[PDB]
Design a protein around this motif. Structure first.
Motif, PDB file in Angstrom:
ATOM      1  N   UNK A  58      53.725  37.284  29.394  1.00 21.45           N
ATOM      2  CA  UNK A  58      52.331  37.098  29.002  1.00 21.45           C
ATOM      3  C   UNK A  58      51.512  38.353  29.253  1.00 21.45           C
ATOM      4  N   UNK A  59      51.617  38.919  30.450  1.00 23.43           N
ATOM      5  CA  UNK A  59      50.809  40.096  30.756  1.00 23.43           C
ATOM      6  C   UNK A  59      51.207  41.276  29.883  1.00 23.43           C
ATOM      7  N   UNK A  60      52.510  41.470  29.656  1.00 20.86           N
ATOM      8  CA  UNK A  60      52.942  42.559  28.786  1.00 20.86           C
ATOM      9  C   UNK A  60      52.386  42.391  27.381  1.00 20.86           C
ATOM     10  N   UNK A  61      52.269  41.152  26.910  1.00 22.70           N
ATOM     11  CA  UNK A  61      51.686  40.931  25.596  1.00 22.70           C
ATOM     12  C   UNK A  61      50.211  41.323  25.578  1.00 22.70           C
ATOM     13  N   UNK A  62      49.462  40.938  26.613  1.00 22.08           N
ATOM     14  CA  UNK A  62      48.056  41.328  26.699  1.00 22.08           C
ATOM     15  C   UNK A  62      47.910  42.849  26.695  1.00 22.08           C
TER      16      UNK A  62
ATOM     17  N   UNK B  85      23.913  48.716  29.292  1.00 24.40           N
ATOM     18  CA  UNK B  85      24.273  47.425  28.756  1.00 24.40           C
ATOM     19  C   UNK B  85      25.270  46.716  29.652  1.00 24.40           C
ATOM     20  N   UNK B  86      25.447  45.428  29.385  1.00 23.49           N
ATOM     21  CA  UNK B  86      26.350  44.570  30.146  1.00 23.49           C
ATOM     22  C   UNK B  86      27.584  44.302  29.297  1.00 23.49           C
ATOM     23  N   UNK B  87      28.758  44.629  29.836  1.00 21.20           N
ATOM     24  CA  UNK B  87      30.018  44.242  29.222  1.00 21.20           C
ATOM     25  C   UNK B  87      30.440  42.902  29.800  1.00 21.20           C
ATOM     26  N   UNK B  88      30.864  41.988  28.936  1.00 18.20           N
ATOM     27  CA  UNK B  88      31.560  40.801  29.418  1.00 18.20           C
ATOM     28  C   UNK B  88      33.022  41.159  29.639  1.00 18.20           C
ATOM     29  N   UNK B  89      33.575  40.704  30.763  1.00 21.54           N
ATOM     30  CA  UNK B  89      34.959  40.996  31.125  1.00 21.54           C
ATOM     31  C   UNK B  89      35.635  39.727  31.616  1.00 21.54           C
ATOM     32  N   UNK B  90      36.924  39.611  31.317  1.00 24.63           N
ATOM     33  CA  UNK B  90      37.764  38.544  31.853  1.00 24.63           C
ATOM     34  C   UNK B  90      38.706  39.173  32.874  1.00 24.63           C
ATOM     35  N   UNK B  91      38.595  38.751  34.131  1.00 27.78           N
ATOM     36  CA  UNK B  91      39.479  39.279  35.153  1.00 27.78           C
ATOM     37  C   UNK B  91      40.894  38.781  34.933  1.00 27.78           C
TER      38      UNK B  91
ATOM     39  N   UNK C 287      45.493  45.953  45.407  1.00 29.89           N
ATOM     40  CA  UNK C 287      46.734  46.724  45.390  1.00 29.89           C
ATOM     41  C   UNK C 287      46.460  47.992  46.186  1.00 29.89           C
ATOM     42  N   UNK C 288      47.095  48.193  47.336  1.00 30.58           N
ATOM     43  CA  UNK C 288      46.850  49.434  48.079  1.00 30.58           C
ATOM     44  C   UNK C 288      47.458  50.623  47.350  1.00 30.58           C
ATOM     45  N   UNK C 289      46.818  51.784  47.524  1.00 28.71           N
ATOM     46  CA  UNK C 289      47.318  53.015  46.916  1.00 28.71           C
ATOM     47  C   UNK C 289      48.751  53.323  47.351  1.00 28.71           C
ATOM     48  N   UNK C 290      49.154  52.857  48.538  1.00 29.28           N
ATOM     49  CA  UNK C 290      50.527  53.044  49.004  1.00 29.28           C
ATOM     50  C   UNK C 290      51.558  52.372  48.106  1.00 29.28           C
ATOM     51  N   UNK C 291      51.149  51.461  47.224  1.00 34.39           N
ATOM     52  CA  UNK C 291      52.069  50.832  46.291  1.00 34.39           C
ATOM     53  C   UNK C 291      52.049  51.459  44.907  1.00 34.39           C
ATOM     54  N   UNK C 292      51.136  52.396  44.647  1.00 34.69           N
ATOM     55  CA  UNK C 292      51.069  53.076  43.356  1.00 34.69           C
ATOM     56  C   UNK C 292      51.380  54.563  43.461  1.00 34.69           C
TER      57      UNK C 292
ATOM     58  N   UNK D 292      50.554  38.356  41.612  1.00 35.82           N
ATOM     59  CA  UNK D 292      50.000  37.291  40.765  1.00 35.82           C
ATOM     60  C   UNK D 292      48.774  36.659  41.402  1.00 35.82           C
ATOM     61  N   UNK D 293      47.764  36.391  40.577  1.00 31.33           N
ATOM     62  CA  UNK D 293      46.515  35.809  41.046  1.00 31.33           C
ATOM     63  C   UNK D 293      46.481  34.342  40.625  1.00 31.33           C
ATOM     64  N   UNK D 294      46.621  33.447  41.608  1.00 25.78           N
ATOM     65  CA  UNK D 294      46.645  32.007  41.365  1.00 25.78           C
ATOM     66  C   UNK D 294      45.302  31.464  40.909  1.00 25.78           C
ATOM     67  N   UNK D 295      44.236  32.249  41.010  1.00 27.40           N
ATOM     68  CA  UNK D 295      42.930  31.799  40.564  1.00 27.40           C
ATOM     69  C   UNK D 295      42.685  32.089  39.091  1.00 27.40           C
ATOM     70  N   UNK D 296      43.585  32.815  38.436  1.00 27.16           N
ATOM     71  CA  UNK D 296      43.356  33.257  37.071  1.00 27.16           C
ATOM     72  C   UNK D 296      44.380  32.626  36.140  1.00 27.16           C
ATOM     73  N   UNK D 297      43.909  32.242  34.961  1.00 26.86           N
ATOM     74  CA  UNK D 297      44.731  31.692  33.890  1.00 26.86           C
ATOM     75  C   UNK D 297      44.611  32.661  32.718  1.00 26.86           C
TER      76      UNK D 297
END
Length: 157
Positions: A4-8, A90-96, A102-107, A143-148
């Motif tokens: 799913x995420x790769x498709x987005x 202006x205001x952008x609408x965004x979907x989280x 993610x700490x920089x130590x992982x990127x 993964x964020x369990x609060x997001x669909x």
């Protein structure tokens, strides 16, 4: 799974957002909005019309981390419901897509070809991140369990 995420992210542009205030990121996370300075506002509006997805990857200055990432669902707009940002467009609408850190130590293995091949954590507010580096960075977040993702996937079509 990551299908799913790769498709987005398949045809996406990616921008680093650097904020000097955790409070504005908290506000943005709950309300699904973002605002930026004029040069970056113009850049994001152009990107919104040019790519299937425009992703903002957030980092609070001096935090040592990214705080999540989100997809634009609109160009910027003026005159709407005013957002009471904590003052230091202006205001952008965004979907989280992810509101977890993610700490920089992982990127540390990821470098951005569009910023002289420096580690992807390095950049000014609005720094564009090349497609593959931005995709891999987004895939590092937990993964964020609060997001669909369903709402986002329906908006792309």
């Amino acid at each position: 799974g990551t299908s799913k995420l790769k498709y987005v992210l398949q045809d996406a542009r990616f921008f680093l957002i650097k904020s000097n205030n955790h409070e504005n990121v908290s506000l943005a996370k709950a309300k699904g909005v973002w605002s930026t300075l004029p040069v970056n506002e113009k850049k994001l509006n152009l990107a919104f019309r040019s790519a299937r997805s425009v992703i903002l990857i957030f980092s609070v200055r001096e935090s040592g981390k990214f705080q999540g990432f989100a997809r634009l669902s609109s160009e910027s707009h003026h005159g709407g419901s005013p957002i009471h940002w904590v003052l230091p467009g202006g205001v952008f609408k965004i979907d989280w897509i992810c509101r977890r850190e993610l700490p920089f130590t992982k990127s540390a293995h990821l470098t951005n070809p569009w910023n002289e091949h420096k580690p992807v954590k390095i950049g000014r507010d609005g720094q564009e991140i090349e497609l593959e580096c931005g995709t891999q960075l987004c895939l590092l977040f937990p993964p964020d369990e609060s997001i669909d993702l369903y709402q986002v996937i329906h908006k792309m079509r």
